[PDB]
Amino acid sequence: AYILPANESFGPLQISLGRTVKDIFKFMVLFIMVFFAFMIGMFILYSYYLGAKVNAAFTTVEESFKTLFWSIFGLSEVTSVVLKYDHKFIENIGYVLYGIYNVTMVVVLLNMLIAMINSSYQDDSDVEWKFARSKLWLSYFDDGK
Amino acid sequence: LGLPFLAIGYWIAPCSRLGKILRSPFMKFVAHAASFIIFLGLLVFNASDRFEGITTLPNITVTDYPKQIFRVKTTQFTWTEMLIMVWVLGMMWSECKELWLEGPREYILQLWNVLDFGMLSIFIAAFTARFLAFLQATKAQQYVDSYVQESDLSEVTLPPEIQYFTYARDKWLPSDPQIISEGLYAIAVVLSFSRIAYILPANESFGPLQISLGRTVKDIFKFMVLFIMVFFAFMIGMFILYSYYLGAKVNAAFTTVEESFKTLFWSIFGLSEVTSVVLKYDHKFIENIGYVLYGIYNVTMVVVLLNMLIAMINSSYQDDSDVEWKFARSKLWLSYFDDGKTLPPPFSLV
């Protein structure tokens, strides 16, 4: 991507990707707070069932983080909230909290997507890439290198 | 860090440079935000002992002295827990003051007020259930200390009303007050780590994000109702189809109403396997109809999600965001303009 802005076909793509990342960071912070909310809550719920669960999810803080993060991409199984004891109150609350976390994930992703859509529909891309490419060229104009 | 010191200084010297600074609406808002951050840190510190996991198996009872009831140490309240109760009581008192000074009808209008009341009520219910469990455990401990003299609670057959309190978590009843307390406490903790959005509109970079997220949720609710009707349609249909094959299926999906709900809800995020519609008997008519209905439900899921996405896209593309956030932030500022609120909870009960 140091070389990408020099190309006419890929330079604007690099600028658009960088702008997307910059706007992505704010929604990452927004998602981080809710992610921490569900991580702490599910860890508190399932910390007392370390040896009484189908898997190790939510038994520790690291396990809760791993399960919740991989729930973003659907890589966490639904058995993460299933207990071995007949404590259906804890299991059902884990089911509800995991489901609410998944729905909140969709809502946050959707809101971020709508913001990205209604933040670029307002020559701008060409000027953006040309400015970046001019900076690249000016970096090689001086003596040396 | 210095909130207790500031509270003490305000109490001893209400009229001074410290008192003048504390009465500033920005300082009152900062104190309230800092107090809630302390509350969140208290919740995290309360579970800090289990951060790397419990060192003992759930089916093993570990106590301090041999004559100790296990439920006594499991249900005893820690100092951090007592601080959490004090904080919760402070916020409940603040909410009750708002309710009494602003009318019960108008109080429910704001989503923040009802959400705060629900979170605090769940906290009170969780701590009440833990208190009942602690009371029962102390009653068992009193019985042990009175009518049992063996210096070892391992060779004595205690009565069941007292023997039940020596059991590990595996033998606890499903309706155990401590189990109810733990579940409600987990819900209250999740709800507690949501009042950061009380502070979000004050920031210029995150305030508009909060307003946009709230608007997205408000428009989301209508499509949730739209999705609920079709979800109920397929839930009832597949439950009716598969209720007669409870013991003749690969898994338990669609055998009961709860199983149908779980399978269909987790099909939204792809967490339900395709074997949910596979039978063990050679009834290919039922199995194929389940396949078709599950596929139609999945396609309908995509269609509803797509239509909702198109609506969201063509409902905001029509300065509006800046005005929205500025209005919300002005409401936040006006909430701290009036006299009072100098000392955030729980440093307000006195």
SS3 readout for chain B? CCHHHHHHHHHHCCCCHHHHHHCCHHHHHHHHHHHHHHHHHHHHHHCHHHCCCCCCCCCCCCCCCCCCCHHHHHHCCCHHHHHHHHHHHHHHHHHHHHHHHHCHHHHCCCHHHHHHHHHHHHHHHHHHHHHHHHHHHHHHHHHHHHHCCCCCCCCCCCCHHHHHHHCCHHHCCCCCHHHHHHHHHHHHHHHHCCHHHHCHHHCCCCHHHHHHHHHHHHHHHHHHHHHHHHHHHHHHHHHHHHHHHCCCECCCCCCCHHHHHHHHHHCCCCCCCHHHHCECCCCHHHHHHHHHHHHHHHHHHHHHHHHHHHHHHCCCCCCHHHHHHHHHHHHHHHHCCCCCCCCCCCCCCC
Q: Quote the CA–CA distance of A71 and B196 in Å, as a whole number.
A: 23
Of A63, A86, A107, the CB nearest to B174: A86
Q: Quote the CA–CA distance of A36 and A43 in Å, as a whole number.
A: 10
Q: Which residue in this structure is represented by tokens 């440079």?
A: B17
Cβ–Cβ < 8 Å for B332, B29 = yes
Question: Least CA distance to B217: which residue of chain A?
Answer: A107
Q: What is the SS3 assignment for A82?
A: coil
Residues 6+ apart with CB under 8 A from B247: none
Q: What is the CA radius of gyration of chain B?
A: 27
The residue of B209, B219, B321, B325 whose CB has the most chain A CBs within 10 angstroms, and thus the best one to mutate to test that interface, is B209
Cβ–Cβ < 8 Å for A47, B49 = no
B204 is in an annotated binding site: no
Chain B CB contacts of A60 below 8 Å: 50-53
Q: Quote the CA–CA distance of B20 and B10 in Å, as a whole number.
A: 9
From the CA of B276, how many Å to the nearest CA of chain A?
A: 14
Q: What is the SS3 assignment for A30?
A: helix
A12, A13, A15, A137 from A133: Cα distances, Å = 10, 12, 10, 6
Residue B148: phi and psi, rounded to 5, are: -130, 125
Q: What is the SS3 assignment for A9?
A: coil
Beta bridge partners of B249: B279
Q: Which two tokens stand for residue B285?
A: 């008519």
Q: What is the CA radius of gyration of chain A?
A: 23
Cβ–Cβ < 8 Å for A100, A133 = no
How much of chain A is helix, strand and coil, in % rounded to 5? 70, 0, 30
Q: Quote the CA–CA distance of B343 and B28 in Å, as a whole number.
A: 7
Q: Quote the CA–CA distance of A95 and B27 in Å, as a whole number.
A: 41
The residue of B50, B198, B304 whose CB has the most chain A CBs within 10 angstroms, and thus the best one to mutate to test that interface, is B50
B95 is in an annotated binding site: yes
Q: Quote the CA–CA distance of B21 and B204 in Å, as a whole number.
A: 23
B14, B36, B38, B274 from B18: Cα distances, Å = 8, 21, 21, 66
Q: Which residue in this structure is represented by tokens 């995290």?
A: B44
Nearest Cα to Cα of residue A12 among A140, A111, A120:
A120
Method: cryo-EM
Cβ–Cβ < 8 Å for B110, B118 = no
Chain A CB contacts of B190 below 8 Å: 37-38, 40-41, 97, 100
User: How remote is the C-alpha of A76 from its chain's centroid?
Assistant: 15
Cβ–Cβ < 8 Å for B77, B128 = no
Resolution in Å, one decimal place: 2.2
Beta bridge partners of B279: B249
Q: Quote the CA–CA distance of A113 and A119 in Å, as a whole number.
A: 10
Please indicate whether, in this complex, the C-beta atoms of A41 and B271 are within 8 angstroms of each other. no
Residue A22: phi and psi, rounded to 5, are: -60, -45
Q: Which two tokens stand for residue A122?
A: 């307002």
B59 is in an annotated binding site: no
